[PDB]
Design a protein around this ligand. Structure first.
Ligand code: NH4
Ligand code: NH4
Lengths: 93, 5
């Protein structure tokens, strides 16, 4: 089912984390689609940390599941954290 | 929708 990628990013005041997300929309079966990293900004905090990749599926932010959640909930959780944020993701070959 | 964070 892939391999687990885990990193804790440290936000610098004034800055984004450095990646974008897509997904989290309700499907015909009532579940939300997965939330995935769609880009990582060059030279950003996420890029310098280096662990995450575009295409990774987000599984957790800190203690909160990112499975079966709306897009806006994932965005809110990311934007809520002003210093350290733990990202748990999964990546398939 | 793709969102930068
Ligand atoms: N860490
Ligand atoms: N939705």
């Amino acid at each position: 089912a892939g391999s687990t990628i885990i990193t804790s990013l440290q936000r610098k005041e004034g800055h984004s984390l450095g990646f974008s997300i897509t997904g989290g929309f309700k499907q015909a079966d009532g579940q939300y689609s997965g939330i995935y990293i769609s880009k990582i900004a060059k030279d950003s905090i996420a890029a310098v940390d280096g662990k995450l990749s575009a295409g990774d599926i987000l599984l957790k932010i800190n203690d909160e599941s990112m499975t079966n959640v709306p897009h806006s909930r994932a965005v809110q959780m990311l934007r809520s954290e002003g210093k350290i944020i733990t990202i748990v993701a999964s990546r398939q070959q | 929708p793709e969102t930068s964070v």
